[PDB]
Tab-separated table of C-alpha atoms and ligand atoms in Angstrom:
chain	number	residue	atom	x	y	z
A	3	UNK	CA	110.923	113.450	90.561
A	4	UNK	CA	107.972	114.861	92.922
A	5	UNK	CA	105.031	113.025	94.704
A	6	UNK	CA	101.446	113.720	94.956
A	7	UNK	CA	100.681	114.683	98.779
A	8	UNK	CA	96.857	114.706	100.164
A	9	UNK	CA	96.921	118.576	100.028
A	10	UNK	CA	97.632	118.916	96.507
A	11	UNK	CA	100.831	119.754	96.529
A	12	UNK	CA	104.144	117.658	95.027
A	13	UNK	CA	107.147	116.855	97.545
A	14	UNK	CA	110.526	115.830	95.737
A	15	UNK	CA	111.467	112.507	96.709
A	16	UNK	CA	114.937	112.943	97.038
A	17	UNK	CA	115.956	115.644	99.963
A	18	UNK	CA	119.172	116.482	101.958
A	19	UNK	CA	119.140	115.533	105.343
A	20	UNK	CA	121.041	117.528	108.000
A	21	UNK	CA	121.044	115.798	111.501
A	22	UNK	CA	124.712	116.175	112.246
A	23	UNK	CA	125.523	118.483	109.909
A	24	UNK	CA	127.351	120.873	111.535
A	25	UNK	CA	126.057	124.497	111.766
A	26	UNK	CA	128.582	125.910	109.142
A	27	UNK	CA	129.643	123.085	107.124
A	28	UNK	CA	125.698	122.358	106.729
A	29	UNK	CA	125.579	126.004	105.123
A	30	UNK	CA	127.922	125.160	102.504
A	31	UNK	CA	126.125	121.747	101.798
A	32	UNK	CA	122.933	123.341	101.308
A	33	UNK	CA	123.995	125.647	99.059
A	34	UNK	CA	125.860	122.971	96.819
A	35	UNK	CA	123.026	120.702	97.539
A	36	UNK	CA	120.389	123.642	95.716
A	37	UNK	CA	123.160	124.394	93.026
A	38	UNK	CA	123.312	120.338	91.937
A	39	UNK	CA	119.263	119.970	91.929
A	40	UNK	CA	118.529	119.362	95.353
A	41	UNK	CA	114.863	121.403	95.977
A	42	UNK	CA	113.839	119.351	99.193
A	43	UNK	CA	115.505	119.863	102.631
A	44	UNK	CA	114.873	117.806	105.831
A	45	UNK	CA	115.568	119.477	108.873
A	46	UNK	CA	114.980	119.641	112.455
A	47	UNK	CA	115.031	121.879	115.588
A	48	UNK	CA	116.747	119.554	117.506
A	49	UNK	CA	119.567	119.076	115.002
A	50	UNK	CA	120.536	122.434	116.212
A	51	UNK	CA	121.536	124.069	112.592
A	52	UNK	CA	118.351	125.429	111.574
A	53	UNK	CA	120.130	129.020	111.695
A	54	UNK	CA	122.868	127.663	109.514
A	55	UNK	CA	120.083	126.070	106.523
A	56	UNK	CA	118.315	128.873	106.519
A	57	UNK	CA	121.465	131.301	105.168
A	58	UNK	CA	121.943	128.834	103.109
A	59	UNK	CA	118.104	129.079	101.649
A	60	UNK	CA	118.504	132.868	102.066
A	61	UNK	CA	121.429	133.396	100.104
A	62	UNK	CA	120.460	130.967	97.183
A	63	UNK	CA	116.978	133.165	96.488
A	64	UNK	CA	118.545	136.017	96.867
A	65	UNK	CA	121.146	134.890	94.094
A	66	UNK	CA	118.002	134.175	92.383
A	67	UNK	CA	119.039	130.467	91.430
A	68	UNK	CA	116.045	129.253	93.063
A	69	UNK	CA	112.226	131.027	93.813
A	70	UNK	CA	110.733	129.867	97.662
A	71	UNK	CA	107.998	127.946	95.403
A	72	UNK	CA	110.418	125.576	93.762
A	73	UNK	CA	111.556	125.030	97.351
A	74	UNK	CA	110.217	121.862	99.754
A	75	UNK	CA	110.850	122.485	103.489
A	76	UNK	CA	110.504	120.261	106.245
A	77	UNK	CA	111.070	120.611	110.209
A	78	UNK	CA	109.941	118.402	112.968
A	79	UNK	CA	108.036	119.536	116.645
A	80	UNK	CA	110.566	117.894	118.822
A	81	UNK	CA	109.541	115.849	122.525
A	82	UNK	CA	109.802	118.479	124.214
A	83	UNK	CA	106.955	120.780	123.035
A	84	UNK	CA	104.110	118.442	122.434
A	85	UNK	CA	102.018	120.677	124.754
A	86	UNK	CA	99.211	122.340	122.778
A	87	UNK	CA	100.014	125.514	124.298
A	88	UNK	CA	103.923	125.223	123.050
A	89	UNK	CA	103.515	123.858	119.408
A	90	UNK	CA	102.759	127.286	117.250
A	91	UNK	CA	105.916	128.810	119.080
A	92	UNK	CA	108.175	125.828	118.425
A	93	UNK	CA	107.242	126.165	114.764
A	94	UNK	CA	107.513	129.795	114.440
A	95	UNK	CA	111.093	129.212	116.412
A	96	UNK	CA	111.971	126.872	113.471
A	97	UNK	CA	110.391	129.268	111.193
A	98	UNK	CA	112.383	132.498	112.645
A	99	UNK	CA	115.756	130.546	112.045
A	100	UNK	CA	115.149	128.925	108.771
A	101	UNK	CA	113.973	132.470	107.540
A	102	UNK	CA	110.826	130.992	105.883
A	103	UNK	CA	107.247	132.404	106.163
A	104	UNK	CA	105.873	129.172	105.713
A	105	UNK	CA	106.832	125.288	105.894
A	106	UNK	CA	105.908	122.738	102.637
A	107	UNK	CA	105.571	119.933	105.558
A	108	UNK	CA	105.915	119.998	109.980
A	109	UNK	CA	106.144	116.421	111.721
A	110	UNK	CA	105.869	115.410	114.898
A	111	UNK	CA	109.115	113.998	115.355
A	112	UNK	CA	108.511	111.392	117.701
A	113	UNK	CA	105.021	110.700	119.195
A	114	UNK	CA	106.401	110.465	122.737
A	115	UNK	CA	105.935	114.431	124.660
A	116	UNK	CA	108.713	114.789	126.969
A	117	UNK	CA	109.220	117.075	129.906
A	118	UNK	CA	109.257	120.701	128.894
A	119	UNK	CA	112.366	122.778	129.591
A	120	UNK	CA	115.512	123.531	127.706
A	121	UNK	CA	116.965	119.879	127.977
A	122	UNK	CA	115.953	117.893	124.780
A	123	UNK	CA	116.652	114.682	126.319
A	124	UNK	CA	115.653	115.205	130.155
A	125	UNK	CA	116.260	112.337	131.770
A	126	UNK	CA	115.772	111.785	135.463
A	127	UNK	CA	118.626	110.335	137.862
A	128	UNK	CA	118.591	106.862	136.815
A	129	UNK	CA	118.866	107.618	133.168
A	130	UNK	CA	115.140	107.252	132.086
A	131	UNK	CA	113.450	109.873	129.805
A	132	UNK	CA	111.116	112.056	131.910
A	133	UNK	CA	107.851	111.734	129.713
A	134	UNK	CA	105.734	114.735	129.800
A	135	UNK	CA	101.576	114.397	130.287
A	136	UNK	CA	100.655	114.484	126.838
A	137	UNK	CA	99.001	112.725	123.857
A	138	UNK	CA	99.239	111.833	120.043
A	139	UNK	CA	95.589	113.460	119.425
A	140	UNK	CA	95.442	116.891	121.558
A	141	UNK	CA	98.928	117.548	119.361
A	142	UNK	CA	98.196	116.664	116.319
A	143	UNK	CA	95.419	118.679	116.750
A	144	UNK	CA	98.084	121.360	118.105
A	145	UNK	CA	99.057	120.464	114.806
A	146	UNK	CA	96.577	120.880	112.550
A	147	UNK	CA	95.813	124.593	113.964
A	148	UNK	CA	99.234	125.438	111.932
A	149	UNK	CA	97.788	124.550	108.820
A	150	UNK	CA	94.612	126.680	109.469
A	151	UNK	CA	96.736	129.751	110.582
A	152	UNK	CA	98.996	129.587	106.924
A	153	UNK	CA	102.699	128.365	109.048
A	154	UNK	CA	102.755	124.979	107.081
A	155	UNK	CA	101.359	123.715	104.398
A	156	UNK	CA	100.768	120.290	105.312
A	157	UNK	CA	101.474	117.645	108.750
A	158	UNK	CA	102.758	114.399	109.250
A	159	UNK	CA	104.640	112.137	111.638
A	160	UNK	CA	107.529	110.507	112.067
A	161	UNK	CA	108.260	107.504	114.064
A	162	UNK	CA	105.030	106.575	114.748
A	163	UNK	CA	103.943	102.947	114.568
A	164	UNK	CA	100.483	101.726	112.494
A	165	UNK	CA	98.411	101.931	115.527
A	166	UNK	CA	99.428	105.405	116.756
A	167	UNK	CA	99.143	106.204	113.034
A	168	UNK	CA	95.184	104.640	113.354
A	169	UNK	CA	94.376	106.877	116.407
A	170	UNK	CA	95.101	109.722	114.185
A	171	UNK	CA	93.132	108.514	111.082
A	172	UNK	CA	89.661	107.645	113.471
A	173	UNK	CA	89.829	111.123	115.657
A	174	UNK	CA	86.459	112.206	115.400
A	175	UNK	CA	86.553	115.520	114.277
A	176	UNK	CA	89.774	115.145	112.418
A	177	UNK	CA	90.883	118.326	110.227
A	178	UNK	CA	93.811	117.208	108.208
A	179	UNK	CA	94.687	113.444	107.739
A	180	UNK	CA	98.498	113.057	107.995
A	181	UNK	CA	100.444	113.941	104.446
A	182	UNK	CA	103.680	111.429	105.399
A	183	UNK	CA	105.166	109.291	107.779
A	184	UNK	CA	108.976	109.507	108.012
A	185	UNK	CA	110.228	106.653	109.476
A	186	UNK	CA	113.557	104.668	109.238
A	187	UNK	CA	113.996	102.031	106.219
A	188	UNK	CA	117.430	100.779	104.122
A	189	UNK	CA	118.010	97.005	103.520
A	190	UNK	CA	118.401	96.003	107.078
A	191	UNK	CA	114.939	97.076	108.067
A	192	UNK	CA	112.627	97.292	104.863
A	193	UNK	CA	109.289	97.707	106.957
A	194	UNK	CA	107.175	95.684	104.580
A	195	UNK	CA	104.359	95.693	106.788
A	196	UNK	CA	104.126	99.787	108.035
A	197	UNK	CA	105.249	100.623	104.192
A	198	UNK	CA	102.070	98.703	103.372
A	199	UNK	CA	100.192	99.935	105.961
A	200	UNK	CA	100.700	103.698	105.080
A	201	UNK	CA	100.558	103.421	101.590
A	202	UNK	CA	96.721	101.991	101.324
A	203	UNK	CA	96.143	105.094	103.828
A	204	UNK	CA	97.115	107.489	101.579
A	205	UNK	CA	99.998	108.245	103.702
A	206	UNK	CA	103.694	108.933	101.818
A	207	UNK	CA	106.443	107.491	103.334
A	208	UNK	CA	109.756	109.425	103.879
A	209	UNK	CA	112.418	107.059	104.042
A	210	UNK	CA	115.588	108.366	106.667
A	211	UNK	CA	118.800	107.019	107.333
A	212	UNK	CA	118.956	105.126	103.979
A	213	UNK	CA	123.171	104.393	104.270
A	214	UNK	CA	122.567	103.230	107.823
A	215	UNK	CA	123.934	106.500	109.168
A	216	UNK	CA	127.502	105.339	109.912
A	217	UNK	CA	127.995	109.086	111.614
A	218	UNK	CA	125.536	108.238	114.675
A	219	UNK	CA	127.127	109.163	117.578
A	220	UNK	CA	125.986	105.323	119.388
A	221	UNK	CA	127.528	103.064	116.256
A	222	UNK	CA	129.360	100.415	118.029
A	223	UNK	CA	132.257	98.580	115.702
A	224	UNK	CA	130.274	95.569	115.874
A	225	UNK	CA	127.229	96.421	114.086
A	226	UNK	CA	126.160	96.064	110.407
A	227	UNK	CA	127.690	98.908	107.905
A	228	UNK	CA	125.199	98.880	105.253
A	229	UNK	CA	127.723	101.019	102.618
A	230	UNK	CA	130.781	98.310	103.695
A	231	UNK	CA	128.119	94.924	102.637
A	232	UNK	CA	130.151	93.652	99.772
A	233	UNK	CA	126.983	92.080	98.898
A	234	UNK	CA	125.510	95.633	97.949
A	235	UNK	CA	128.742	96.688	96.923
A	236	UNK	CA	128.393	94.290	93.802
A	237	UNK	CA	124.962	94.922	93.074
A	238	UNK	CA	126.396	98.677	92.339
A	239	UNK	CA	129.458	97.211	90.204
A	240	UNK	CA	127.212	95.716	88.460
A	241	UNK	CA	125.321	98.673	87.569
A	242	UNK	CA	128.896	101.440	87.713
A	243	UNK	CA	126.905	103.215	90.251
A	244	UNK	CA	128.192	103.380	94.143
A	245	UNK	CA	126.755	102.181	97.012
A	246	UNK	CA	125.395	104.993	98.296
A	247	UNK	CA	124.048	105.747	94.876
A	248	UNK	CA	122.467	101.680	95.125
A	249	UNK	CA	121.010	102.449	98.640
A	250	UNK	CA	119.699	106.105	97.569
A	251	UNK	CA	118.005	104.236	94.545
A	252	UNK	CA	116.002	101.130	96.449
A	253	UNK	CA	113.564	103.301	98.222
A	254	UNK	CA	112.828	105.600	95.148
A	255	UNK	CA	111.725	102.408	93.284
A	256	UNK	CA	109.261	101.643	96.581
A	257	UNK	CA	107.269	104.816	96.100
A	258	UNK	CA	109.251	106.539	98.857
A	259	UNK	CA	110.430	109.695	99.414
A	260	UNK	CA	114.495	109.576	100.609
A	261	UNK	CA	116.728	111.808	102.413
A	262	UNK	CA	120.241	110.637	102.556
A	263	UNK	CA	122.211	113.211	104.784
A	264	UNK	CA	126.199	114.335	103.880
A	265	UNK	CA	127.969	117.383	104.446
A	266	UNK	CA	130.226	116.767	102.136
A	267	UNK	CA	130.106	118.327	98.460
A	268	UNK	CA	131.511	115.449	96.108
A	269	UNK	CA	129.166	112.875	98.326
A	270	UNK	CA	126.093	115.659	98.061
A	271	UNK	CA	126.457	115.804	94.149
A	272	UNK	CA	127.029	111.500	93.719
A	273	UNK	CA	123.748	110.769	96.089
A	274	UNK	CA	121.907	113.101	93.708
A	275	UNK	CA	122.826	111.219	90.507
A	276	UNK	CA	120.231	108.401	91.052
A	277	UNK	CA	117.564	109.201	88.172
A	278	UNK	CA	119.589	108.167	85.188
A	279	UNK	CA	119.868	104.223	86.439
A	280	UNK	CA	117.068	101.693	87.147
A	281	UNK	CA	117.708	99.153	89.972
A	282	UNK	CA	116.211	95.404	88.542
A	283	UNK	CA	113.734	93.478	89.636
A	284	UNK	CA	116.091	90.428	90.930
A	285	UNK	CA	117.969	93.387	92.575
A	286	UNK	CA	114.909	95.033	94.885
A	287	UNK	CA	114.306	91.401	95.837
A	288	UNK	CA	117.801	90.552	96.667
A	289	UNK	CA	117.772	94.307	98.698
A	290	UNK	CA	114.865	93.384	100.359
A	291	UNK	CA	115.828	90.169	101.065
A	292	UNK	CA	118.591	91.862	103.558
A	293	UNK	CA	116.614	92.818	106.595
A	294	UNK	CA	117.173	92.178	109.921
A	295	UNK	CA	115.032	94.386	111.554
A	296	UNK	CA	118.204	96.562	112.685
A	297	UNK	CA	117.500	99.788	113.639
A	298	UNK	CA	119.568	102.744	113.788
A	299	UNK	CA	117.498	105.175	115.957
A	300	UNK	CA	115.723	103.744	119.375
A	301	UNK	CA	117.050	105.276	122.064
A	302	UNK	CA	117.108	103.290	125.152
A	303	UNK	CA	116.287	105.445	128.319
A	304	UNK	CA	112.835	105.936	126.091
A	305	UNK	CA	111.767	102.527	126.345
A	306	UNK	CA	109.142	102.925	129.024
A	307	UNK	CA	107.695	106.151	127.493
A	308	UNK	CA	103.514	105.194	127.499
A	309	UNK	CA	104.097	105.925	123.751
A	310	UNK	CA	107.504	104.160	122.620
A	311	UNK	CA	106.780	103.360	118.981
A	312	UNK	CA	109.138	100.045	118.405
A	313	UNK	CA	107.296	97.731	121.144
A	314	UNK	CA	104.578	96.803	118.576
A	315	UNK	CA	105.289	94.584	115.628
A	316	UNK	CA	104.686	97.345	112.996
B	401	NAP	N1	112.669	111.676	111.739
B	401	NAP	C1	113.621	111.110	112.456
B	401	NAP	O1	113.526	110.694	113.609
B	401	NAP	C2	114.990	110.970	111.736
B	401	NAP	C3	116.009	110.142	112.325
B	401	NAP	C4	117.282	109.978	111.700
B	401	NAP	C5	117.513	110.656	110.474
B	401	NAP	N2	116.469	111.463	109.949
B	401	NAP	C6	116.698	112.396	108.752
B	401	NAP	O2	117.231	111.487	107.750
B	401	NAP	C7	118.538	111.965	107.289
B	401	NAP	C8	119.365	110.796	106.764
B	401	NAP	O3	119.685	109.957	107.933
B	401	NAP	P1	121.080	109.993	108.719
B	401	NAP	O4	121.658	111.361	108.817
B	401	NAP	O5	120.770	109.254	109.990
B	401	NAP	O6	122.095	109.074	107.897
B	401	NAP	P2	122.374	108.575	106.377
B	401	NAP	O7	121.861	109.573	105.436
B	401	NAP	O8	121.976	107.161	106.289
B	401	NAP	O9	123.986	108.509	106.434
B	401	NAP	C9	124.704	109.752	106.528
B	401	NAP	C10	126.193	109.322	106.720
B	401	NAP	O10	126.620	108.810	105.489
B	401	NAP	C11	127.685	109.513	104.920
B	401	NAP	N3	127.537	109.588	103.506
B	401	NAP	C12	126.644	110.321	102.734
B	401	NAP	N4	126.748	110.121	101.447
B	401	NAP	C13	127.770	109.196	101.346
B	401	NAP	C14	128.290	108.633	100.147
B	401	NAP	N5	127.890	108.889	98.908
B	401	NAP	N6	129.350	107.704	100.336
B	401	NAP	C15	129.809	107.399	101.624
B	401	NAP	N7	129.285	107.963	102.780
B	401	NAP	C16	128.245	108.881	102.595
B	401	NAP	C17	127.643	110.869	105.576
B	401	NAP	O11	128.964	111.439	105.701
B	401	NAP	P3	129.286	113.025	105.461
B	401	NAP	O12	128.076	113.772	105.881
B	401	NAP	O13	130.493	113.240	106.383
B	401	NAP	O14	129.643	113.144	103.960
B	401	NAP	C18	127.128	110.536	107.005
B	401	NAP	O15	128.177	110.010	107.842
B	401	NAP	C19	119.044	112.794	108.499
B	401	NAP	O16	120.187	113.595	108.334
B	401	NAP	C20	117.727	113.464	108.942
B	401	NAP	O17	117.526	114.610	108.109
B	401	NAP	C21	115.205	111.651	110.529
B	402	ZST	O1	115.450	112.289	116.101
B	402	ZST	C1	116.148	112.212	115.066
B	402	ZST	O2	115.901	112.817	113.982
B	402	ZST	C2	117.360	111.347	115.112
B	402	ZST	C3	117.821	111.086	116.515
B	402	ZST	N1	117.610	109.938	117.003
B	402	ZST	N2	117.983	109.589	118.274
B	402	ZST	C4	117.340	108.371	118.755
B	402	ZST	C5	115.998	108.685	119.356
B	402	ZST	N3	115.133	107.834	119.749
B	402	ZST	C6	113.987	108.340	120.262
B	402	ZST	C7	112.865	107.705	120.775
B	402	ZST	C8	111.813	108.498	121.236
B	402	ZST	C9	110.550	107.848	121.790
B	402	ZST	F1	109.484	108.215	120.997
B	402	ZST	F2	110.680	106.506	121.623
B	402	ZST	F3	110.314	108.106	123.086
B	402	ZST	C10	111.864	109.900	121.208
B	402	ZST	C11	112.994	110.539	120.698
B	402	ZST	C12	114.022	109.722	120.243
B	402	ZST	S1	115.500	110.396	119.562
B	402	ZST	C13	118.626	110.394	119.089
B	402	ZST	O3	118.976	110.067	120.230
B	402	ZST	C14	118.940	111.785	118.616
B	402	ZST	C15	119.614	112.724	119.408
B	402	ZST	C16	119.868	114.006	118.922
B	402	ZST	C17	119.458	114.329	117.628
B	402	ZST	C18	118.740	113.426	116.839
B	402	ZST	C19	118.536	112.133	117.319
């Protein structure tokens, strides 16, 4: 159920997501989510529910269903405070409304800075992202200063390509190598290659959006609906399982980590029942065989940003 990380410790590799949760209904789900088995949450400051998890955390140790220890918490540094000088608050912001002391793992979210200020997405006039003068290296070593000041207990990234992931690994002087890369990956974009890539690093790989996240707020009617494939729908029949169930299992039997995101307490409790069912061989080919190289997440007034991730191949 857990996964050795490069700092010793074990991260579940099944977690609740929460980007769109909202702030209230995401309390409830976290609390079913903990009662069902779930010990891993995924969360973000710019998700804008942090508040809402953490009661949710609060209550359930307080009940005493759950000690902090058992627990695997993750945020993200979002765009807009890649700034050395701005990453310890941003994390003890995120710490402050989860109600945690520490973190189990803090990515940067994206590896583009943006323009400080309280926009998350400033854009300029013309619609184009309004980058902020900042690099990969002088945060993650923004980053790595959290670790040696007891906020989190390990750092990653997210979103981040293999060469922004090799400027990290040859810093001279590096402190901490990077625990996990979170990146998108369901049938329609396996990433064969950056899987690859990270695991001979060392590097775990967080798999997000595994159903294709249906609920983002760009989905045009048009575009491929990963839990509607009929194709996938019959590799679950097959197996009495659903198809969320199917697309919760494929990355679990690719030595990822997953964190499928619902709000919703019947869905929370089925997308946890994935350990007692083994997807078969002819199956993970047949699921791999499905990509398109569609992704969910690239948004477009960030595709001149000096550090846009999806440019390069992998
Ligand atoms: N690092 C990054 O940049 C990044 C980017 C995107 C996502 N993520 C993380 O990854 C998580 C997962 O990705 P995601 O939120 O994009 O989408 P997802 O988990 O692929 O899909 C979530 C959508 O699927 C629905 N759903 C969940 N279980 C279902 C089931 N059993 N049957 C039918 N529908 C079901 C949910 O509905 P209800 O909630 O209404 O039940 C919601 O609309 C996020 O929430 C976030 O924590 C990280
Ligand atoms: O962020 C999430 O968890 C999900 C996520 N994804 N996207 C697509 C994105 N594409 C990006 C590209 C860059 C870039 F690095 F390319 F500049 C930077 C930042 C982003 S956000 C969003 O637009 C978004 C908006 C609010 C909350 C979460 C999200």
């Amino acid at each position: 159920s857990r996964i050795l990380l490069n700092n010793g410790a074990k991260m579940p590799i099944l977690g609740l997501g929460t980007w769109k949760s909202p702030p209230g209904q995401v309390t409830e789900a976290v609390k079913v989510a903990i009662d069902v088995g779930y010990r891993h949450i995924d969360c973000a400051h710019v998700y804008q529910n942090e508040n809402e998890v953490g009661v949710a955390i609060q209550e359930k140790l307080r009940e005493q269903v759950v000690k902090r220890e058992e627990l695997f918490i993750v945020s993200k540094l979002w765009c807009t405070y890649h700034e050395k000088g701005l990453v310890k608050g941003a994390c003890q912001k995120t710490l402050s409304d989860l109600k945690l002391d520490y973190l189990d793992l803090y990515l940067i979210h994206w590896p583009a800075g943006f323009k400080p200020g309280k926009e998350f997405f400033p854009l300029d006039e013309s619609g184009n992202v309004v980058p902020s003068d900042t690099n990969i290296l002088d945060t993650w070593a923004a980053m790595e200063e959290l670790v040696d000041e007891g906020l989190v207990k390990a750092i990653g990234i997210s979103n981040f390509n293999h060469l922004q992931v090799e400027m990290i690994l040859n810093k001279p002087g590096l402190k901490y190598k990077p625990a996990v890369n979170q990146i998108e990956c369901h049938p329609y974009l396996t990433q064969e290659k950056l899987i690859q890539y990270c695991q001979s690093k060392g590097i775990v790989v967080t798999a997000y959006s595994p159903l294709g996240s249906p609920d983002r707020p760009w989905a045009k009617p048009e575009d491929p609906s990963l839990l509607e494939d009929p194709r996938i729908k019959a590799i679950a029949a097959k197996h009495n399982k659903t198809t969320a169930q199917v697309l919760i299992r494929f990355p679990m039997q690719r030595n990822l980590v997953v964190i499928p995101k619902s709000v919703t307490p019947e869905r929370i409790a089925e997308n946890f029942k994935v350990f007692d069912f083994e997807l078969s061989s002819q199956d993970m080919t047949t699921l791999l065989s499905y990509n398109r190289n569609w992704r969910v997440c690239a948004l477009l007034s960030c595709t001149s940003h000096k550090d846009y991730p999806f440019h390069e191949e992998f």
